[PDB]
Every structure is written in structure tokens, then in C-alpha cells.
């Protein structure tokens, strides 16, 4: 209700892009235009907010945001 | 020119229109978007020629490129240098201040550009100063390119020159303040195609790129001429396939319709399409990927070979032609199963025809070949750099002692194998010994609790510089320093105090800054850290 | 090198050692720091010839100074280009990122460097690669320089080389990507000191330099040699006396106790000196400032005629030596009234002794010298770079048709009056006429509504690029673009379309990008508007 | 009472200085470590802000800061 709210904002903060077009099913790619290292600091963003430990070895088969959402 | 036909020159025009064998009706396809013949590629670089001259190109001029793979790169790298013009390579995953740099350093005349690289030259069109022409590639019929070319005639009589005139010409982003030029000539590129067909096509059974192959790259082949292999495919007049943008599902359609047998790429790209799920029905048992963009990892290899791909590693730079050394297997090797022939696999390999490598120390003094004592290599070929452009100290250090210093330390096999162990700019001084950083980061990676691993060194009073472990921790994993080094020291076969392990200082911070060429940049880490 | 004694080289030791007058118990003034004699200050450049042996620079090696005006920079000026190496004077006023490429391109190998620059040098220390030392200049007795140099015997045999070897090189940040590299020869800097000398030594009784003088530069010494005037100085064997850091307050306490005569500098600190309260009471009536940055205005010049200083004005760039005119009046024009004198003041000047200048087209038609007709100023002299440095297409375009292009455009009197109008590239093509944008930017500046003005150039269709406006408004004036239309309507005396007001679409924009030189940039402007 | 307060905040926003250091005495440069760019920037935000219409004429005079908050 709330926890998947504000995961559309963080991934939208650091790349400017709205929460409207960014949700769940937007990918950490592609549409938020981002690079090999945007991607990865906005997984680290992910647990620097939630305090999450991510290994990256989770983000080796995660592509759609959707799935680390879900994950929280 | 005095022409002297009695005395022969050494031309690319040589490697095309005098190949080992010329099939007029043998392909040359571009992913989905274009097919035609040998007959055809002949008479488009003839009118390569033609439209070049048109523009005002002369013997000296330089021809920028800033393309994916395709037909029209290798019509530029058969076309340009013929004219008697340099051809500049661009490196498209630099920094738009980079490439910047390096078109005004160059000094280039015509640039050609593909539609999607041109918001990289939106921010830099301003300052260049030295460009007259852009050329906008296109993957459809409003291309410029082929407007430009079917407007000239297929006719064409190409110069002869001296075969010392430089042919190419690309900057390498290596451990240096600003990009580095290197440039070849034709003789150098035309021995390069000679040695290695020598070298790789008279081998038995495993491993040789012969005259029924089906070569695709999988090398952005602006970075050291796709490792010669296009001028190789051209003079064996085999069929050539060109992907364009690297797409794993998009390359596992194209290594199954158009039946590739032989590739090159780099060990990320080999994980992506072996990882990939497109791939796992995909008959593999014919293709021979040789890997040589680093240090190819010996369970990709198994995996790989456990899906009967005859795959192999070779070693080279941009420096160096690059071809330096490849992985050949003798006929008793293909015996073992498929752990002993990954660890053979997985090594730099031997020196190829002509070339002389060695290792030294410091003072240049031709350590022995014995598989553990390690030096730098050093070697002497035909197809080497003899400096950079437009640079002396560099140019001077990079030829010390009449060898070449590749920046790599190794250690050689009493029969010849060479095993790579790091470079020399990563060495870890403790005291009076000399030990690697890649051992310790495997190490240390080998803990479930880490992602990445970086270990740079950290000077000190009585054993000089020690080193420093920068890693990244894994899931609900907060191990600290001290866990990390227990790790380390639960290991064995270590030398120096007592297993290596007494000034370790492992450290864990969150990002790692990474290169454009997704390497980490170790001197910005020291430099934030030191 | 072959002497034959007989072969007289020009060479910059001969300005030192045989010079037009020398006194040896004459001064040479730092700023409150310290004081010495001429004896002392050969005395120290032999040892400063010492050290720079001792530390191993040979007759091809580049010396880098990051200094300020000091005694230490004028014993470089001498020390290093006699020993045979290039002196680089480093500009401190660029970014850090082009002060890197500088160095990188010029392949310094020893860095002079004021404490005061250290935080420059830490951003740029780790991607320097060339320099080997690093020698810090402090104020004190804790410097580096001074402990070098009280470390070497006072006896040097000053070596004879080709008078056409380089002696000095620095770069210019104009209109261009990268900075350029100028240069120049032991003969070109004799000859630019003697010509100068026999220029403006020999005026009947206005604005003269003879051996009475006392020179103190504002000019900061590492732009164009200063002008060229420590060497002039030196030649005649005056009383120098170098500030340091240039604050009005200091500068004044220092016009006032040391006497000083002769000076140059910029309009800005000349207004800054002037508007200083401590400059109301202080005496004037001996000064000989010669402004020579860019446009001495003609306000400026009233002024300062008003406070009685002999002010002036000269001409010049890095390429050119750098003087190229001065302004000299003839007895009659003395008589004349302080609104005459500082029109006449204000001008470019006349060619100064074996310096030939036309105005020519962009087809070298060598336009009339009426005062009306204008056109690029093209220039030959003995003292002019050749090229620039490791540069081809830049420096085929700079000697364009056998003369150099200062990328000025001026019209010249009948008598010989030079008038500078703007620059080449700041031209505003309409139609089929050529304007300037300087005088319409201070007819609009002429309004009572606007800060600092900008006009550029926007393209259209059958007028071709028609004028615009950048201005900043005032306190209260929320005044749009109809009233400054108005106002320039308001005007008179202009030519094309009835008063050339038709297309001026005058915008405001709130903040006005500026270089590091502050001046604003017009092709960044261009680039963010259009 | 609160006008002078927020002139303390502006010249202290873009140039991440604490408010008690920045104060009325606190002159435009030295202390803020503004150089000629950043110091007409801040000048023209104390506008962008206080709605003022500064002409840089009464800028080429002040150089205290106080001169500008009293002159609000
Ligand atoms: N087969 C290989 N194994 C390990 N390292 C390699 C191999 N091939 C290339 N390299 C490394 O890649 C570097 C090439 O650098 P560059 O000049 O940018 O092309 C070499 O210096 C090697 O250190
Ligand atoms: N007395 C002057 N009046 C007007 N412009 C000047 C004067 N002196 C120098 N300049 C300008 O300053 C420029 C020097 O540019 P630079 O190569 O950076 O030294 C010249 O090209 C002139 O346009
Ligand atoms: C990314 O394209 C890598 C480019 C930078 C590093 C150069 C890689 C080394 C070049 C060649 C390796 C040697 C293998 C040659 C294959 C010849 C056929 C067997
Ligand atoms: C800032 O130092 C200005 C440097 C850049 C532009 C060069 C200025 C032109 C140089 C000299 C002007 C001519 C006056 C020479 C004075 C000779 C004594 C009368």
C-alpha cells in the first residue's frame, strides 16, 4: 500500500522522472535512462534508504524494479 | 612515387585484391538489413574511392569513423588507407571530452557518423575546429553513405606508395593523464594478417580459422582493427556477417541462421549469451569463440566447453597489433577431460610467428623461464607501435632498453606457456617482496559476503606500502573488517609473513568508481582514499 | 655548436651582460620583502644557472613557473632561456582542467610553483606523467628556491647556441577548443626589446622610457613576457619594482614610496587604482601607465588626464611579440584640450619601428587607409610565432596568404591612426553590409535601464543573421524589449535599413556567462540560445 | 527582525555556509569563498528572492552585505 509507493520514488529522485510513468512494472532500465552505473547506484540507493543488504548477486537476475519491490 | 615494379611494396590493395582465395559470389551480410557479394564489396569500395576523392581527400589526409559493426566499416577499412589517408578509429564509449580530445589531436578532415551516436557530438560540435564534412550513417535508404557512393562510378586506380605510410590510427584510454596515439602501417598490417594465418591456420585439429569458415565479430572493431581479423576473413574470402549493435537474442539468431562458425569477444559478452535463455536449445558444436579481451575466467571456460564450444583465449593490446600470443592446444591435450583442458584454455598461451617476449625486472635482466619466477614482458615484433603521436617521455618509456613494455607481469612455462598475473601499476611493494592484487580479490571474493572486491596498496614506515581490501558486503550480511580477515587468513599457500596476512586493513565502501571501459579506476580510489 | 666568433648570434645574454647602461648599486624591489642590487641579481641568476644544471636540465628541457610578479619570475626570465631550455609561463588564471592540458602538451619537466597554487596542483598532481620536481616558491626563508639557490657558487660560463633556438612558449585561450601554443626564438625577443626601444625612447617629450625611469608592472607576467618590458628594463638598468599580488591599496604605497614612473596595465585595475579613496591625495603628476589590455575607454582616459598621468594606449596579442602599435602625439597635439588629447589617447596607435600592417578583405585586397573603410588587420614583423606549437591546420589559417591574421578589424587614418572596432568573429553579417557589435552593445549600455550588454548574431532568411541583444535591466525598470527597440530608434548616424533598426529582436537574459579572463563568452552564448 | 534574518539564509544557501558565521558583517567575499561569477550570481538570487531589481550599480559599491540587507 505505502511500501511500493515510495520505491516508484526513489529510482524516480535521482534520475528526474515522474512517479506517474515510474511503478513497478518500469524496469531499472530504458525508460529512466540510465547507465550501467546509475543502475547499480540506484540499487544501492534502494538500501540506502529500506536498509536493505543488496549483493548485487539478487540484482544479476533482477530487470524490471517490479521484482526488487516485491523483494522488499 | 618511384614505382620500381621489380621492387615490391607491402599494400592493403595487396591483402584484397591478391587473397588467398576470391569467391565473387561468396556474402558479405549485415544483420537483417543488407546482403550482397565479394563482386559487389569491390566495386562499393571502388566507389568508396571515388566519392573520398571527390570530397578532397589527399595522401595524407585522416577519415574519422563513429560506427557499429557493419558492411560500411569495413568498406572504410579497406578504402581510406588505399587512398594513401589515415583512418582514424573513434572510441564511441569514451567521454565526450575524451573524444573531443582526441578529433583535435588527430587533426581529422571528414568525420562518419551514425545517426544514434549524434547527441555525443551535439555537445562537442562546437569546439573541433578541424572537421569540414559529417557523413551521417543510417540503417535505411536515407543513408548519406550510400547516397554519396551510388552517385560515383565502380572504376578506380588505386596509388602505389611506400608501404611504411601509416594506414590507421586509434587512442588507447590506458594508465595515462590524457588518451595515447597509436598508428600503423601498411606493411604492419599486411605482416599481422600473414603471421597469424601462419600461426593459427596450420594448426592440426582445434582452434584454426580456415577457407570454409563463417566469421561474425563480436569485437567493436574500433578498438585494435577487431584484432585484424576482418583484413584475416577478407584475404580467406570467407562469408562475413555483421551484427551491428550487440544484442544477445538478436547475435544467438545470427550465429543460428547464418551458420557462424568462428567469432571473437570478450568474457561479459560470452556470459550474457551462454546466460541467456534463447540459448539453452541452440546447437553450439561447431562454433570457436576465442576470447581474449581479459583474462577469461576458468568457469566460463567449463561452462563453455560443457557446451562444446571450442573456445580459447589469446592476449594482445592496442599497443601491439595486437595479436601477441594464442592459446594451441597440442594433439594429446584434446585427451583431457574437461577441468584440465579449462585450466589449459584459460591461459594467455604461447607467442605467435615472430614475436620474441620475455620477462624482466627493473633493471631488465631476463628472468628464467621456469613457471613461478615473474617479471614484466617485454617483447619485439613486426606489427608494434614504434611510439606515440605526438608524444617523447611516453614514447621513450614505452621502448626502454630497445623492447616494448607491455605493463603486464608474468610468468612463462618451461615449454612456453605464459600465464598472466597482473599489471604492473596494481604491484604490491611490502618491504622487499612482490606479490599480486587479482589472487587476493579472488580470494576474498570467494567469501559469501561480498559482490565486488578491489585491493589497492597503502604505504608504511618499515614494510612499505601493505595492501587494502575495498570490497562490497551481501544480504543481511554486516561483516565487519575483522570477519574479512579471518576469511583471509583460513586460507593457505601464502608466502611472506607467515601467510601474507598482517597488514591486510580490509575496508568495505559502498561504491566502486568504474572507467569507461567498466573497469574500476584504481588511481581515482587511491586518490579519494590516499 | 661551431661559434666562428666573428658570426654574432642575438641572444638574450647579451641583453643581460651588454646592456645599454648598467649600475650596479641600482635596486630591484620586491614589494616589503626584499631588496637587492644588480650585482646581486647577476650574482643569483649564474646560481640559479648552477641549480638548474645540478638538477639536470639540458639545452631541450622546459622549466614550467606558476608564479606572481616577483624578482624570482625576472631571474627566471634570464636563467633558463640562457642555460638553453623554454621557459613555459603557465597561466594561473585557467581552469585547473586546461592548466592540465597545458602541461601535458608542453612536456614540462620541472614546476616552479608559488604555495599560493598548491590547491590548483592538487586536482591535477595524479595525471601529470612529465614532471619530475616540484620546487615551491614561499615569501619567506622557508622557500625552496631561495634554498636552492644559496647552495651554488656565483661563477656560470653561459653557453653560445643558435640564436634561432626557443627561449620562451605559452599558451593562448582564444577563440578555439584547445588552448595554442606560441613560442618564440632568443633573436625575436632581442629584436622585439631593441625595436621597442628605438620606438618609444626616442619621442620628443611625451610618454617616453628612458634611463631615468622606475618601472613597476601591473601587468601579471606570465601572459606575453609582460609586454616585453622586464627585458627593456633590464637593458637600460632602472629601478624595478615587482608588487607581488596586485591590491590597489598596496600598489599605491607603492607608487608613492618607491617613485615609481613607467607602468602598464589593464582598464580595470587602472580604474580600480583611480576610484581607490586613498588615491585622492596622492600624487600623480609623474606616472606614465600605458594601457594595452583591451579598449582603453574614453571616459577612463579623461579622468585619468584630469588626475595628470601621462596614459596611453598600445596594441598588441600573443602571437604578435606582442607590440605591434603604440600611441605617440606629435608636439602640436600637447596643445590640444583634455577631451581632444584623450580622443586622441584612446586610439590603437601607430605601427611601431619595422612593422608593416594593411587591412585587407576576406580576399586579401588590401582595403584604402581612408579612416571609414574597414577589414581585418594582417601584419608581418620580425618577432611573430610561426606556428603554433604542434599544430598544421590552425596555423595554416593564422598565415593565411603570407601575412598573419590578428582576427581584428580596424580602419586606418590617412595619417596613419589605427581605430580597432571589434573582433572577426564577433562580425554581424546582414544581408549584404557588415556591422560591429561594440558600438551598438555601448549605445544600448548609453540607456539608463541596463548593466552589462551583449549583442550576438541570429541567422535568417533573406537578411541573412540579423543583431541581437543580451542585456541585463535595473532597479525598478522592469523595462521589456519595446522600450529598448525604442531607445535604439531614438539614435542616429546608421547606415542599412534607415537607421539599421528593423531586426534587433532584443531579449534580457538574467545571468551573463564569463570566461576566465572575464570576458563574456559569446559561443557559449550562441550555443545555450540558438 | 525576520527581513535581515533571510538575507543571512541566501548568500548562505548556494555557497553551503552556516547562517551564524553568515551574518550582516559578513561581507560578499573572503568568508563565503565567492569568486567574481558567484558573487554577481548571489547578487542577482538576493533579487530572485526579495523581488528587488538590482542594476549591479549599487552592486559596483557594496561590499559588506549589510549595505544590501539595509538596503531592502
Ligand atoms: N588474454 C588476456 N588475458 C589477460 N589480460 C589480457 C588479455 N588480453 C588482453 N589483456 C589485457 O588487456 C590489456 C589491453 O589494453 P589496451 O591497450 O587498452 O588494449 C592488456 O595490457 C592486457 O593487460
Ligand atoms: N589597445 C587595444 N585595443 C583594443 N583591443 C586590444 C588592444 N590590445 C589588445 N587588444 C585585444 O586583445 C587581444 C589579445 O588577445 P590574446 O591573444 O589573448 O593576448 C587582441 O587580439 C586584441 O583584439
Ligand atoms: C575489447 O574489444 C578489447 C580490446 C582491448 C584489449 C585488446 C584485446 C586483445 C586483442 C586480441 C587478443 C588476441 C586474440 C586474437 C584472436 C586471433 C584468432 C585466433
Ligand atoms: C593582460 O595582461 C593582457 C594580456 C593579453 C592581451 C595582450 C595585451 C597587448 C600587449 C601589449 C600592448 C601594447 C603596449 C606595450 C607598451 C610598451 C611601452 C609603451
Known sequence: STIEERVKKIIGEQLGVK?????????????????????????????????????????????????????? | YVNDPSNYQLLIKNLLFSP?????????????????????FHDRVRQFANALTKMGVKKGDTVAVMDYDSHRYLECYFAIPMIGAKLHMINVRLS???????????????????????????????????????????????????????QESTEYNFPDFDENTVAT???????????????????????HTMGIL?????????????????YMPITPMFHVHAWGLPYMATMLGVKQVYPGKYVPDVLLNLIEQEKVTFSHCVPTILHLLLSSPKSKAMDFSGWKVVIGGAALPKALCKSALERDIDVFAGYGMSETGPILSIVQLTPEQLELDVDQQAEYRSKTGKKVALVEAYIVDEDMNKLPHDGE????????????????????????????????????????????????????????????????????????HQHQSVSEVAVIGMPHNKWGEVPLALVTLKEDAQVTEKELLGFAKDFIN??????????????????????????????????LHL
Open chain 2, 373 to 444: 619466477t615473474a617479471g614484466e614482458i617485454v617483447v619485439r615484433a613486426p606489427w608494434l607501435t614504434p611510439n606515440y603521436y605526438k608524444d617523447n617521455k611516453n614514447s621513450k618509456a614505452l621502448w626502454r632498453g630497445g623492447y616494448l613494455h607491455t605493463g603486464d607481469v608474468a610468468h612463462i612455462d618451461d615449454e612456453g606457456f605464459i600465464k598472466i598475473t597482473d599489471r604492473v601499476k596494481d604491484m604490491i611493494k611490502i618491504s622487499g617482496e612482490w606479490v599480486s592484487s587479482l589472487e587476493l580479490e579472488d580470494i576474498l
Open chain 2, 494 to 527: 601464502k608466502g611472506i609473513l607467515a601467510r601474507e596476512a598482517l597488514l591486510l586493513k580490509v575496508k568495505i565502501v559502498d561504491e566502486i568508481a568504474k572507467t569507461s571501459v567498466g573497469k574500476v579506476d584504481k588511481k581515482e580510489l587511491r586518490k
Open chain 2, 169 to 191: 590510427t586509434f587512442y588507447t584510454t590506458g594508465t595515462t593523464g590524457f588518451p595515447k596515439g597509436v598508428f600503423f602501417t601498411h606493411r604492419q598490417l599486411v605482416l
Open chain 2, 20 to 40: 588467398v582465395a576470391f569467391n565473387p559470389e561468396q556474402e558479405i551480410v549485415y544483420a537483417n538489413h543488407r546482403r550482397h557479394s565479394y563482386k559487389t
Open chain 2, 96 to 150: 565526450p571530452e575524451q573524444i573531443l580530445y582526441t578529433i583535435d589531436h588527430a587533426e581529422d578532415d571528414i568525420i562518419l557518423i551514425h545517426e544514434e551516436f549524434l547527441p555525443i557530438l551535439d555537445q562537442i560540435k562546437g569546439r573541433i575546429d578541424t572537421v569540414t564534412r559529417y557523413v551521417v550513417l543510417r540503417d535505411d535508404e536515407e543513408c548519406e553513405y550510400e547516397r554519396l557512393l551510388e
Open chain 1, 19 to 72: 512517479q506517474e510513468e515510474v511503478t513497478n512494472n518500469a524496469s531499472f532500465v530504458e525508460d529512466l535512462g540510465a547507465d550501467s552505473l546509475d543502475t547499480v547506484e540506484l540499487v544501492m540507493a534502494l538500501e540506502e534508504e529500506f536498509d536493505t543488504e543488496i549483493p548485487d548477486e539478487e540484482a544479476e537476475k533482477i530487470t524490471t524494479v517490479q521484482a526488487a519491490i516485491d523483494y522488499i
Open chain 2, 198 to 214: 601462419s600461426t593459427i591456420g596450420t594448426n592440426a585439429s582445434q582452434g584454426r580459422l580456415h577457407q570454409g569458415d563463417i
